[PDB]
Design a protein around this nucleic acid. Sequence first.
DNA 1: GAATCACAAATCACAAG
DNA 2: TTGTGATTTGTGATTCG
DNA 3: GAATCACAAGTCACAAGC
DNA 4: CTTGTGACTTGTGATTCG
Lengths: 53, 47, 53, 50
Amino acid sequence: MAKKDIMGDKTVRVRADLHHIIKIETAKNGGNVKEVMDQALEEYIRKYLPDKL
Amino acid sequence: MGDKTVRVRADLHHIIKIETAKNGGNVKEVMDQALEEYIRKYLPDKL
Amino acid sequence: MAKKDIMGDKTVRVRADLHHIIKIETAKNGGNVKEVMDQALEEYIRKYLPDKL
Amino acid sequence: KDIMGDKTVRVRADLHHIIKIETAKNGGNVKEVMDQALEEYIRKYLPDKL
DNA sequence: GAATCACAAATCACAAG
DNA sequence: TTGTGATTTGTGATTCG
DNA sequence: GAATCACAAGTCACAAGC
DNA sequence: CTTGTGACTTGTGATTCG
């Protein structure tokens, strides 16, 4: 989407313990943290702020 | 433990600013929740 | 250290399974791949090539 | 077989140089050495994993 | 995983045998 | 005609990254 | 095939304002 | 203080070079 396609990334804070779990996971299996964050965040929005996306 | 930093898609971060400005809250709250709800949904094992 | 504070990085390619071990260990117990590369290589040069340090 | 793929990593510049000169001088390449140093690290500190 | 060294074996070539 | 030297070409081993 | 590059992910440490 | 963020570091697939 235009706004996704074109805009950049933006730094955000997160609970370390939650973060760490994800980092361990990705180190083991595939992927990377941002990837999961972006999904986690998207799924939040689609559920709690459906119209905004 | 405390906080870690993550870069996320600016178009989503945008949506969250607007909302937390308009109704209550802050960006960190949403992340913390979003991640916990994700981790529960897909990696519940990790207790 | 002055020399060491402005010291840059070269990139090198290592066996994947070795990398994967480090990826996992660091993600669990802190540190990062580069940190480990540096220590590993210094200890090796110190071991077999002490002149060059 | 022990065919195995690779992964790019960073190393401090001066150290890489010391290898690049020694291997240039008396044969070998950096990749070999850089692997050997890594394997030996892993045996020192993470032998279980090896 | 191509380029360039280095060296062996075809290709030629004029002259003598 | 055919043996010697000069000459070019194919190719396996080797360098550079 | 080793070596290097450049663009993405990840972290840091000052900035804003609670 | 806690939270927000741009500058900087680290990570690594893509690309070069021969």
